[PDB]
Structures are given as C-alpha cells and as structure tokens.
Enzyme design. Sequence first.
Site, PDB file in Angstrom:
ATOM      1  N   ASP A   1       0.866  -1.204   0.000  1.00  0.00           N
ATOM      2  CA  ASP A   1       0.000   0.000   0.000  1.00  0.00           C
ATOM      3  C   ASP A   1       0.891   1.240   0.000  1.00  0.00           C
ATOM      4  O   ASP A   1       2.123   1.166   0.044  1.00  0.00           O
ATOM      5  CB  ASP A   1      -1.041  -0.076   1.132  1.00  0.00           C
ATOM      6  CG  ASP A   1      -0.510   0.139   2.542  1.00  0.00           C
ATOM      7  OD1 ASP A   1       0.665  -0.149   2.791  1.00  0.00           O
ATOM      8  OD2 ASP A   1      -1.294   0.610   3.382  1.00  0.00           O
TER       9      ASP A   1
ATOM     10  N   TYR B   1       2.896   4.852   0.802  1.00  0.00           N
ATOM     11  CA  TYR B   1       3.601   5.405   1.994  1.00  0.00           C
ATOM     12  C   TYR B   1       2.607   6.085   2.925  1.00  0.00           C
ATOM     13  O   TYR B   1       1.724   6.805   2.462  1.00  0.00           O
ATOM     14  CB  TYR B   1       4.658   6.430   1.573  1.00  0.00           C
ATOM     15  CG  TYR B   1       5.872   5.863   0.890  1.00  0.00           C
ATOM     16  CD1 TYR B   1       6.748   5.062   1.591  1.00  0.00           C
ATOM     17  CD2 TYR B   1       6.212   6.221  -0.408  1.00  0.00           C
ATOM     18  CE1 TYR B   1       7.904   4.564   1.015  1.00  0.00           C
ATOM     19  CE2 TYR B   1       7.360   5.717  -1.001  1.00  0.00           C
ATOM     20  CZ  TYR B   1       8.190   4.854  -0.305  1.00  0.00           C
ATOM     21  OH  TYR B   1       9.329   4.345  -0.867  1.00  0.00           O
TER      22      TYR B   1
ATOM     23  N   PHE C   1       6.558   2.886  -4.164  1.00  0.00           N
ATOM     24  CA  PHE C   1       7.881   3.216  -3.551  1.00  0.00           C
ATOM     25  C   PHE C   1       8.497   4.531  -4.061  1.00  0.00           C
ATOM     26  O   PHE C   1       9.484   5.022  -3.456  1.00  0.00           O
ATOM     27  CB  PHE C   1       8.849   2.045  -3.720  1.00  0.00           C
ATOM     28  CG  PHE C   1       8.306   0.771  -3.124  1.00  0.00           C
ATOM     29  CD1 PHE C   1       8.417   0.541  -1.762  1.00  0.00           C
ATOM     30  CD2 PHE C   1       7.685  -0.197  -3.905  1.00  0.00           C
ATOM     31  CE1 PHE C   1       7.914  -0.619  -1.203  1.00  0.00           C
ATOM     32  CE2 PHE C   1       7.183  -1.360  -3.335  1.00  0.00           C
ATOM     33  CZ  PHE C   1       7.298  -1.557  -1.987  1.00  0.00           C
TER      34      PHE C   1
ATOM     35  N   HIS D   1       9.300  -8.033   2.062  1.00  0.00           N
ATOM     36  CA  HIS D   1       9.160  -6.593   1.771  1.00  0.00           C
ATOM     37  C   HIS D   1      10.404  -5.829   2.215  1.00  0.00           C
ATOM     38  O   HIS D   1      10.986  -6.164   3.252  1.00  0.00           O
ATOM     39  CB  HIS D   1       7.920  -6.108   2.495  1.00  0.00           C
ATOM     40  CG  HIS D   1       7.437  -4.773   2.042  1.00  0.00           C
ATOM     41  ND1 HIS D   1       7.976  -3.590   2.513  1.00  0.00           N
ATOM     42  CD2 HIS D   1       6.472  -4.448   1.150  1.00  0.00           C
ATOM     43  CE1 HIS D   1       7.337  -2.578   1.955  1.00  0.00           C
ATOM     44  NE2 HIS D   1       6.380  -3.086   1.143  1.00  0.00           N
TER      45      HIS D   1
END
Length: 228
Positions: free
Chosen positions: A69, A71, A82, A192
């Site tokens: 999802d 930031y 990202f 992640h």
Amino acid sequence: SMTARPLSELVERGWAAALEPVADQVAHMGQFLRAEIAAGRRYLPAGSNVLRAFTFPFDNVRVLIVGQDPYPTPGHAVGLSFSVAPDVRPWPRSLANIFDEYTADLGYPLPSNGDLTPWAQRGVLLLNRVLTVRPSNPASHRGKGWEAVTECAIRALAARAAPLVAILWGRDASTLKPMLAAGNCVAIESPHPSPLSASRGFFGSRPFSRANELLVGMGAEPIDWRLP
C-alpha cells in the site's frame, strides 16, 4: 474524479480496456474515498495520483513491481509504488533499503533522488496491492475493495501475448502469485524492503538482475534499471 469520470478518461487507452471488468469497482472506490472525506478521515496519495501507475502504456509493461500500500507519511506517496517526488529527502527507509539492494545487485551508484518515474517510462509497472492508505496507518485500507482492481490488472497483463516478470515484495503482493501461473509469466518473490521484514530475505535477493535474466531467457529486452 474516479467516482465521476470513466476509465477512458482516468487511465491510458490500453489500461482502460484492461480494467473494463472492474469499471464499476473503480467507481465504487471513488465513493469509498468520498465517504472517508465526508467523515473527516484523510487518504494518500492525492486523488489525481491514485491510478497513476495505469497512466503509462499497458502494452509496454515488461516487469511489474508490487508492494503492499502507499507510503503512510504525508508528502511521500505519488501513486507509483515506492516512488517519491524528486525534492523529497531524506528517502523513506523502505526506499533507502531498495537503493541499497539496487547498488549491491547492479554495481550502480546511489541514485541522485527518490524518483522512480524512469522505471515507469521503461516498461516497469509500479503497483501497490491496495491503492490508498489513511495517513500514519499502514494497511488501513486493506480489504476495502482495491484488491479486485489490482487482481484484474495482473490478470490482464498475464493474458497479453507477451513475456512478463512480476517482482512481488511482501505478503499482500504475494496473493497475486496464483494469477501468474501461465507459461509466459514468471514471479520473483521476497520479503518486503520495509525495515520490519527486509533482513528476512529482501537484502541479497538480486531482484533487478534476476528480472533481466528471466526477460532475456523469454526473448524480451531487459529493463534499463540505471537511475540518474
């Protein structure tokens, strides 16, 4: 605007056709975000950036990167997984981790800034499994209807008569693995890059160079990963 305007207006021509099965679902997500504002809760990224990943050509995608999802900190998310605006510093810690692996894997120097648009412009889809978050609350919009949209996007890419490599970062990204079973698709999976998970297998995973090996093997052009 996704409550009010059709996919033909919101996203690139190829993507508008690819997301036809979730046209009603996208309008529904528009109403969901309208209800959050009505109730005095916030969302990120900005409304006009929510579908940004689908504003680069569907036909040109060779690799997708999938995160969880957007930031959670106001000023970070811009609708490309990202990515941050060219003037953002310091980098968010997940992106600092991505750039560490990027230099370790490919030999390149640290990028000048946090802007991943070059990747979006060179056939990398920068997707989050879920396309909105409430500020300061990771995964706050998990299970609110985005998952059918990102599932439809991966299914559509996979059905194209073209090779595809998927780089799936963390557990929510990995739920797209079943939709990639066909012979023209290969998935790379790792924990992640978040500081909470990165030390469990993100570091040393070499996603960029492995993606290019997989592409070359399928007769596709590798991604030029080099950021300025």
